[PDB]
Amino acid sequence: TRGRVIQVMGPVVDVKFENGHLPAIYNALKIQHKARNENEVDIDLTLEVALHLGDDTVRTIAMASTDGLIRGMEVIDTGAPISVPVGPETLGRMFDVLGEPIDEKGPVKAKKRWPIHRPPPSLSEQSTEDEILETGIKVIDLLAPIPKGGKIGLFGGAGVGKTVLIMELIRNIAYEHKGFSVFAGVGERSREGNELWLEMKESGVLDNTVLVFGQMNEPPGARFRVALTGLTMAEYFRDEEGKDVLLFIDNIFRFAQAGSEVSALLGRMPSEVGYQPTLATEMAELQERITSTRRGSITSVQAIYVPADDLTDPAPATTFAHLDATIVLSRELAEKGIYPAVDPLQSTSRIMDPRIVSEEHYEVARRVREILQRYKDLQDIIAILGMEELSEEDKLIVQRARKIQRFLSQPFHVAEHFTGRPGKYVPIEDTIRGFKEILDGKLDDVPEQAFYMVGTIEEAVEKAKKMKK
Amino acid sequence: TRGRVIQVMGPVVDVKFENGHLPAIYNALKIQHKARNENEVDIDLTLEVALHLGDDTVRTIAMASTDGLIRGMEVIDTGAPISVPVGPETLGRMFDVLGEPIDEKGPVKAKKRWPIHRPPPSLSEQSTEDEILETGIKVIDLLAPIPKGGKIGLFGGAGVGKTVLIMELIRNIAYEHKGFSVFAGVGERSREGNELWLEMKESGVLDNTVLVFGQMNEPPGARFRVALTGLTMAEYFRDEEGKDVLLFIDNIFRFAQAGSEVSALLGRMPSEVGYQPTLATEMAELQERITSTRRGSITSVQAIYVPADDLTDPAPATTFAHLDATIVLSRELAEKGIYPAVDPLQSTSRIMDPRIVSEEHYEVARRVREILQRYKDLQDIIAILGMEELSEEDKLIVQRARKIQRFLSQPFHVAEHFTGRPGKYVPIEDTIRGFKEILDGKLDDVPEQAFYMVGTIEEAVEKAKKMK
Amino acid sequence: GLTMAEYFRDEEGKDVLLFIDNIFRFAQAGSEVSALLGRMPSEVGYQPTLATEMAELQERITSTRRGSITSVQAIYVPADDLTDPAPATTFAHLDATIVLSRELAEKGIYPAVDPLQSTSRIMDPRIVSEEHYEVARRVREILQRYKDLQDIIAILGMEELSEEDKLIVQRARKIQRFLSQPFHVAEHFTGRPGKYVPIEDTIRGFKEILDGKLDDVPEQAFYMVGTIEEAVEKAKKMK
Amino acid sequence: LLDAKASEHAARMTAMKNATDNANELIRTLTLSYNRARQAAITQEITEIVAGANAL
Amino acid sequence: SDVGTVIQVGDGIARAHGLDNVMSGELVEFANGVMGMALNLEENNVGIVILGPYTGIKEGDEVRRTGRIMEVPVGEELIGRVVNALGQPIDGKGPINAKEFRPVERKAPGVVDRQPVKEPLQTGIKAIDAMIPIGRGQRELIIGDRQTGKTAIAIDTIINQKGQDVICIYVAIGQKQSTVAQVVKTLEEHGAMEYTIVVAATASDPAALQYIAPYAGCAMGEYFRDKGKHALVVYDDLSKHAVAYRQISLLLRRPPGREAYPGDVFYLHSRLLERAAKLSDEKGGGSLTALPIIETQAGDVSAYIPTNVISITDGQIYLESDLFYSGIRPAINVGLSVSRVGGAAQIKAMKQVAGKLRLDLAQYRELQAFAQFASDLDEATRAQLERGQRMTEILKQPQYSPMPVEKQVVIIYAGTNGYLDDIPVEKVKEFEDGFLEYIESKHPDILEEIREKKALDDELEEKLKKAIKEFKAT
Amino acid sequence: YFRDKGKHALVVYDDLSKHAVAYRQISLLLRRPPGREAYPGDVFYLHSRLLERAAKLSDEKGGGSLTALPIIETQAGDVSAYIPTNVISITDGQIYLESDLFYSGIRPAINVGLSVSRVGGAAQIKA
Amino acid sequence: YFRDKGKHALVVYDDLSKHAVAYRQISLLLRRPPGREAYPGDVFYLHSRLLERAAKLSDEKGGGSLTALPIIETQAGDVSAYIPTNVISITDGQIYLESDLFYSGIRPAINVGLSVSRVGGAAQIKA
Ligand SMILES: Nc1ncnc2c1ncn2[C@@H]1O[C@H](COP(=O)(O)OP(=O)(O)O)[C@@H](O)[C@H]1O
Ligand SMILES: [Mg+2]
């Protein structure tokens, strides 16, 4: 029924309901007030119920600014959680955490609205048909294959290339897989939401993609529930349309920091290094709903900020448990000009077994990690002592590792404007064939410079000639 | 007289009294209830009073599980602390923290019970006649002597031979000293307690020993009070019988940890590294009763677990404030095949001064520590370069050190199921004479292998002739 | 004390010296009081008002168009940690900051001032001579280069360091002790008369060591001497 | 020259062995100081949580 | 009265008025149908921990006492089923009609109720059964980095138990439903579900169910021990179980201790692991063995929870991230892994060859580092190096393929006596498969003698029969 | 005001660390529940609601601009602290100053191998 | 009493480290909020109020004296700990004893590189 505002302290609001009944936990509440006189301000606010307190009273987290609120203001119970539009009408549109459109294109007019808090699929509804999702990116498809219905994490510091790698993956799925994608900008910088919206509106990829953002300047309650809004929109395409869809989440670190801020605002005791006591429960409520079932599949690419180079921080550490594959991006590779800057020695996946991928794929990826590690074990000796002191076998091992290290580099379409390089997509058969031909020592009398930024290996062979060598 | 449970929170239970008076602090309470219907469970429980709360209410710590308790259940005040039987009828017996017999041998039927919380001896009752206790163990008796009425710390990892050495000391006191021993176990693996019980039951030592157990799986209230039960049983032998008795504590680190858990449950504010604020007070209540008087004496050997292999931790640091001596069982000695494993360079005692022990005892112990350190300072030249390059003085020092290092070894009586060796006992005069005879260069011809696992020095001389 | 020093500035227009042996005690006294007043504690148990209380004292200690207050203050650093809320809050208010190191004191170098953490507002090319600025720059740099080498000298033998690093170590060794001086107020502790050194002889002294004119003089001759001419006769007093 | 090469290789080997040994004791001692500095700081943060929660 | 009313609801914790006659630890039921534990009894309220979705519970809802302490169904009816932490079925194979229910809280066996372990538990892994023996009442810890093979070793152990009279219980605490489904299908593909029970509390289940899961799985394991049979219990990760208890304790406002865990953590795991034991012949001679698993960050074994469980258990199996990525399986660190209670229970036939294996690998593991170059070391050390490399190849084994004890004895006997000293390192795996099929297809007398005598009497037949294989088919 | 009228503006905040301390003081005296390093949970929203107002507008809005240069002080080099990591995550790039480079004679004292700007390349001229 | 009547006295405190632990216990049981190393904020006033009563009085007061010799215990040689540095800040000098030198056959084992007195030189005889 109708309740009244009792307390206001930053993003936290307390409401009393009295007669009828109290709202449920996670239920959405609405405040709609028109200024009764010139000393007041008009307010339009949404609140999420977090806990029951006694005396017919409830504590809530505000979804927007609490400035201008007054004690005794009327509050309305919607009878359900935050509900967002679902369907094909949501394609090519930008959204807020509450599912209202941000763009001036008009009302979405969708046929149905789904709640943000629903139960995940059951153990019976789980499928076990593991296979590989081809990305067209030569480092991921070899060293850390993506399982359909699985989760892939991108770990690194600032300026390594996480958002550009996510933008190129969104393009490639819309190019050859012709699937539907969802991007959830959890705590997104408004400068970056503008660059994602412009790349997709001009490249045409936007017509097959859903954008959910909110803003990094919104209160913590909004930064916390936004990843569920993108997920609830991606669930409809799997469950009601039976499709295979890709969900991109940029920086779940902001998701973890926002649950911490909400727990601190509600008065819970701090856990390890000041995070919320419920961190593992909250991370899982989002990661579990992403799975392949007998109806269809949701796969996910996630970026994770590593604060101060420490992978032992609770936020990165709780995330590792739900990752089928792992990619670590090294700042040392990025500044040396090698893009996408993925570390060949720290990237791994669970699907890297002969029972799930070809014997030729498994054998090549093994020979690559081995020769790279052998070269890492020799770069001290190559610097202090003359290279003329290295044996014949080690000398060839170094040259092959040197060609392979740059052959992992690839020019992206979304990054053509920066360097002017056209952009390339490489199929799995040519990635395996390329590294196999270098490892087998067939292609040795070709200069290292020919393997940097080239796509397939035939393009490297013609480039050697283009450089007159 | 008759209280009623008002609150229940894990081990903590609150009781309100009426029509009479409230119980004293440290006092034991009893709950005996029979299921009134098929929805209830029978319960038999003991609680210890911690503090008075006001409104005729008292807070208590339960000695066993609180599952099945109901608000409003009747409580009986026993009028005094936990009382355990005392007398010579306690020897060769296994007990619980409340003094009830564990073994199926029947009721103990002792003539008196003694409160477990009792004042320690006053300054006017103490004894300053520091003397020594012959253990018959060649490394303890020379390098780290044990004083009558003192506290000794035993250090070593899981599997270095602590249980083997404890049983060897209990057995040795029961063999020639014909004295009484008491062993208390706190926060211990019930499996280890069983391996010790069978090994004692076969070596005949059990008839001269008392066993008390508080297991690693018992609630914090029991793990906290068990060391006091062994001590209250050892005190009767000192006070009413005038004997000299030995108290063993399985791990005083679980004594310390159990007090930390009870403090965290009671809601007191913690101190440095999360131990209880009362760690120093609680350690003293156990440690000061362990003293020698004009009636008789109590001595104690306590094993310490060093958390994270660092001695700066509060429990070890608060324990060392009460200790008189230290014995260290070393992992490097264990892998080398040396079974007693006591480190000759890290073991020490307060008694090891020329104004407590004889001048000759101090001189031999000094010359032994010095030759062993000198040998340890030279094994690099001997290992990296050929042994033919060492000078004559260092070579003779090495030959004496090579014989001495293994002449410190002794086969234990409790080890016959492992290695089959008969076991040896070495008296103080032959320990001093033995090391003196090698140090003074009188016995250098005898081969090195003859000094390993032989007892006295003469046994090494016959072993050299008999091995061929 | 501050209210009495303010009268001479405000109503009499004079230039005054204000000495305070401990402002840390002023901060701890506010900390002891705060729990009993009913306030919530902050980092390391301190009061929520710590920076406001230090500014109520420090903003009054200033020179105006009427007169001037110059002040020397001592700040106790608990457990040798400069990151503690009381010492940390104080650095924002000072025009010059001198930090004293136990490593220098335990080595017998007094007054024990740390050359790499001590600084002042006045250390600008616009406020001091070119010769002063250049000598101070060269001193701070040679001591930092010596600090960056004590690990390499521990892992490898000193005979493995280059000639340039070898000279830098010897000059840094002479400089760290030429910074030592016997005070008049310390004759009971130092066993020496006590000395006063003018700025001209300080600059001339360090320049002469930095330029390598004194390479053939033992490090021990630079300890506890007021001026450079003394170091040279202290070398003569030892064959 | 052959004796010089043998003595050079032996000298570089023995010197680098001592240098490696020196580096390890320095790493051990530094690591104990890193552990003590980090462990000392962690127990204080836990103490602030206790005091802060009891202050409400 | 029997009924009370909710007065406050938080994240999975509730408070209620009434419930006058409820007892400490009793199960209580909500009007919706969800269940909760009565933990704290106060003068005027009861603190309840919710065992399901709390979002359907509101202030003013009716809550009723069940009249029973928290119990889980047990019996023969549970074999070959997948259940939640409260025993409820989650496999869709219909209801369970268990006739016996036992509390999840029981006191472990006393000092005199036990005996030392004298009979082995065969895991089927050539590195464990030879170097890290396991008894039928021992508590061994599996420890290492994430994604290194910790559950694969436990599943390989359960699959090896097909012939022995051991009932296997697998408890999943905070695991992904997908991995749980993959485990249930692997057990069905190998037939292990004919003698296995699977208990689950997945990552989306409330922290209270993840806390109760190991105790419920232990109570099912105790019924077989109380009737004189043998049982095996696996706890998929004690690291997530500690995190789940840390959550409930902080939400009950208890003050933290070391690494933000409560002081009560050690008691949570000692109380659990001390219940696994071999009973005395007077109690019936029954047994229960436990295989807990723990995850270490970056290989740090010195952390609080890892050292806390190392102090409770009887030995550890250490797994390395570096070996797993170096093409080695099961990736066990044999120079650090040891068992204290083992060796006494191991069969005589394995002891006669395990002694040689341990001495040869000790020599190899030390010199292998210095001899990194091809052939600079002398023949006296070269012989050690090649033997170590060849024995390391004999220690390698593929997933879900347990090797029986008799075949383990003959392959380990082949390596430790130098018959493989002329075989190239790359052919050792092909030689092992070919030699075992040769011995089983035409020399079953050797295997049947080892199976019944459990010791090697006369080896002469095996030496002659093996020379015939080497001369005819490499 | 200048941005809304089509002109360019630059805003410097001499120290955001003292601004966070000033908010901690008011919040603790008002009895709001503390979090990490004694600060209120509300402190990320404090600086993000401020720094997101610096932007370059579209041509329909007038093409105006506002750039910001906030400053933060670290205790003994601890970049991993609460307020520093909070503001490092909000900005589009960071310039790191080292006490080590400053005494060694590298005078502006910037750690070029650690400092970063995402806009690099787009901000600069072709030359 | 001796000092107030013109006589000379001396007092020894066997360990001030244990005196501090006793005050920490009483203060935590009265629920006073802790500070550094869980000791109360009042812990400096505890020892400084006791040690400043040791003095040499003026001739008008009688010329009497009271000397003090407090004792403290360091964990692993950590002279830098809170209670140790706190008492060092009140006294007129420190005598530091090394556990390392003591096992090298050296007595009294005083580390002269750290040990010093603030009254020193003046109290000692001219010879
Ligand atoms: N493929 C690439 N080719 C060239 N420059 C790149 C590429 N990927 C990233 N960059 C550069 O580095 C920046 C990466 O910024 P961003 O995507 O925000 O990194 P991150 O989120 O990992 O911190 C880009 O703005 C661009 O300047
Ligand atoms: Mg980034």
Author numbering:
A (entry chain D): 2 to 470
B (entry chain E): 2 to 468, 471
C (entry chain F): 231 to 469
D (entry chain G): 232 to 287
E (entry chain A): 26 to 499
F (entry chain C), G (entry chain B): 248 to 374
Authors' text:
The minimal subunit composition of F1, acting as the ATP‐driven motor, is α3β3γ1, with the γ subunit embedded inside a hetero‐hexameric stator ring consisting of alternating α and β subunits. F1 is the membrane‐protruding portion and rotates the inner rotor complex against the catalytic stator ring during ATP hydrolysis. Here, we used ancestral sequence reconstruction to infer the catalytic β and non‐catalytic α subunits of a putative ancestral F1‐ATPase. To reinforce the structural integrity, TF1 was used as scaffold to accommodate the functionally crucial core domains of α anc and β anc ; nucleotide‐binding domain (NDB) and C‐terminal domain (CTD) of α anc and β anc were genetically fused with the N‐terminal domain (NTD) of TF1 that forms the stable hexameric scaffold (residues α1‐94 and β1‐78 in TF1).
Under this condition, five distinct Cryo‐EM maps were obtained: two fully assembled F1 complexes with different γ‐subunit rotational angles, a hexameric ring lacking the central shaft, and we also partially assembled complexes (a tetramer with the central shaft and a tetramer without it). The resolutions of the cryo‐EM maps were determined to be 2.5 Å for the two fully assembled complexes, 2.8 Å for the hexameric ring without the shaft, 2.5 Å for the tetramer with the shaft, and 2.7 Å for the tetramer without the shaft, using the “gold standard” method. The rotational angle difference of the γ subunit between the binding dwell and catalytic dwell in F1 anc_core was approximately 34°, smaller than that of TF1 (Sobti et al., 2021) (~44°). Comparison with TF1 structures identified the two conformational states as the binding dwell state and catalytic dwell state, indicating that F1 anc_core shares the same rotational catalytic mechanism as same as TF1. Structural alignment of the hexameric ring components (chains A–F) between F1 anc_core lacking the γ subunit and the TF1 binding dwell state yielded an RMSD of 0.002 Å, indicating a high degree of structural conservation within the ring. Since the hexameric ring without the central γ subunit is considered unaffected by the central γ subunit derived from TF1, it is highly likely that the stator ring of F1 anc_core is prone to adopt the binding dwell structure without the γ subunit. Thus, it was confirmed that F1 anc_core has two distinct states pausing at binding dwell angles or catalytic dwell angles as expected from Cryo‐EM analysis, while the motor pauses predominantly at binding dwell angles waiting for a long reaction step to occur under ATP conditions. Thus, F1 anc_core essentially follows a reaction scheme similar to that of TF1, featuring two stable conformational states (binding dwell and catalytic dwell), even though the binding dwell of F1 anc_core is significantly longer than its catalytic dwell. A candidate reaction responsible for the long‐lived dwell is the ADP release step that was suggested at or near the binding dwell angles (Adachi et al., 2007; Noji & Ueno, 2022).
